[PDB]
Design a protein around this ligand. Structure first.
Ligand SMILES: O=C(O)c1cccc(/C=C/c2ccc(O)cc2Cl)c1
Ligand SMILES: O=C(O)c1cccc(/C=C/c2ccc(O)cc2Cl)c1
Lengths: 115, 116, 116, 115
C-alpha cells in the first residue's frame, strides 16, 4: 500500500466514514487526470488506491469531498473540498499516508512518509 | 477589506513573511480565472486583495505558495502549496479571513467569516 | 502587551467569544501560582493580561476553558480545557501571542513570539 | 486496548519515535497521580497503557514530553510539553485514541472515540 488516505472528524471525535476521495496525477499538459478514487471505510481509511508499479514519481492531488460529508450531517460547511497537492519522490521513503482532520470551517492535513 | 489572508509559521513561531498568494474565481465556463494576488507582510497578513464591489458571489480558490516559502528557508516540504476553495457571499456580503498555519509536512487552515 | 491570547472557533467559523483564560506561573516551590486571568472579547482576543515589568522570566501555563465554551453552545466536548505550558523571557523580554483553534474533539495551538 | 496514544512529527513527516508519554488520573484531593507511562514505538504509537478493568470513568491527563523530542533533533521548541485533559465516560464509546501532531512552536491534538 504505497498510498493511504485517512480522514478524521473533529466535531464528533470519530473516523470520517464514507468520504469520497479522488486522486489525480498531473499530466504533461499540466492538467489533472483521474488516477484513483474510493470512499473511506468505517475506520476512516482508504487503502489500495494504487500499487508500487503505478505510483511513479510526479505531482498528485488528493481531493477529499468534505462538503458532502458535512451536508449529510446537517452542518453548514465552509470548503468546497480539501485538496492536498504533493510530489511523490522515489529517493526518500516510499509509503505515503495522507491524513486529514475535518471541521466545518477548518481542516488540517499532514503527511506521514515511511520506509 | 472583505478578503484577508493570514499565514503563520509553526517551525519558527513567527508570521510567515513574503508568502505569495494567488486568488482565483470560478468562471461561467467552469475554469479558474485569476482574481487577485499578493504577498504577506511582516505581520503575516495580506490586505487589499479586493473590494466589496468586486468580490461578488462565486466559488473562490486561495492558493498559498508554501513550497517556495519553505525552500527559501532550506527546507524541502511535502506540499506544492496549500489551497483553500470556498463559496463566498452567497447569502450576501461577508468579511473573510483565511488563516493558515504552516509546517514542512503539514498545514492547518481555518476561516473566520463575519457579517458587517 | 507582552502576552496576548487569541481563540477561534472551527465549527462556527468565528472568533471564540467569552472564553475564560487563566494564566499561572511556576513558583520556586514548584507549584502553579495564579498570575493573570480574563475573557476573550468579541474578536476572540484577550489583551492586557500583564505588563513588561510583571512578565518576568519563568515557566507559564495558559489554561483556556474550552469545555465551558462548548457546553454553552449545546455541545459536550472531549477536553476539560486546553493547556499551553512554556518558558518565557529566558533570553530577554519577548511578545507572545498564544493562539488556539477549537473543535469539540480537537484543538490546535501555536505561538507567535516576536522581539520588540 | 482502551487507551492508545499516537504522536506524529509535522517537520519530518514521520512518526514521532521514542516520545515519553505519562498518563495521570485525577485523585479525590484534585491531585494528579501517575497512572501509566511509556515511550512511543517506531510507528509513533503507544499501546496497552491500561486495561478495560483499570480504565474507569474519571479525569485523565496525557502528558507528552515534546520538549525532549525537539531538543534531541536540535530544534529549539516552545512548549514544556503537550497535555491533553479529558473525562473518560462509559456510556459513550469505550475505545480512546489520543493523537498529537507536533511542530516546534505548535501542536494539534484530536480524540478518536469508537465502539
Ligand atoms: O488573527 C490573528 O492575528 C492570529 C494570530 C495568531 C494565530 C492565528 C491563527 C492560527 C491558526 C490558523 C490556522 C489554523 O488551522 C490553526 C491556527 Cl491555531 C491568528
Ligand atoms: O489517528 C490515526 O490513526 C492517525 C494515523 C495517521 C495520521 C494521523 C494524524 C492525525 C492528526 C492528529 C491531530 C491533528 O491535530 C491533526 C491530524 Cl491530521 C492520525
Amino acid at each position: 500500500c504505497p498510498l493511504m488516505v485517512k480522514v478524521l472528524d473533529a466535531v464528533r471525535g470519530s473516523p470520517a466514514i464514507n468520504v469520497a476521495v479522488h486522486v489525480f496525477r498531473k499530466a504533461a499538459d499540466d492538467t489533472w487526470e483521474p488516477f484513483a478514487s474510493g470512499k473511506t471505510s468505517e475506520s476512516g481509511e482508504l487503502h489500495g488506491l494504487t500499487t508500487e508499479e503505478e505510483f511513479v514519481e510526479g505531482i498528485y492531488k488528493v481531493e477529499i469531498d468534505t462538503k458532502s460529508y458535512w451536508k449529510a450531517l446537517g452542518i453548514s460547511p465552509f470548503h468546497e473540498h480539501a485538496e492536498v497537492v504533493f510530489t511523490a519522490n522515489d529517493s526518500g521513503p516510499r509509503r505515503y499516508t495522507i491524513a486529514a482532520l475535518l471541521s466545518p470551517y477548518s481542516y488540517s492535513t499532514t503527511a506521514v512518509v515511511t520506509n
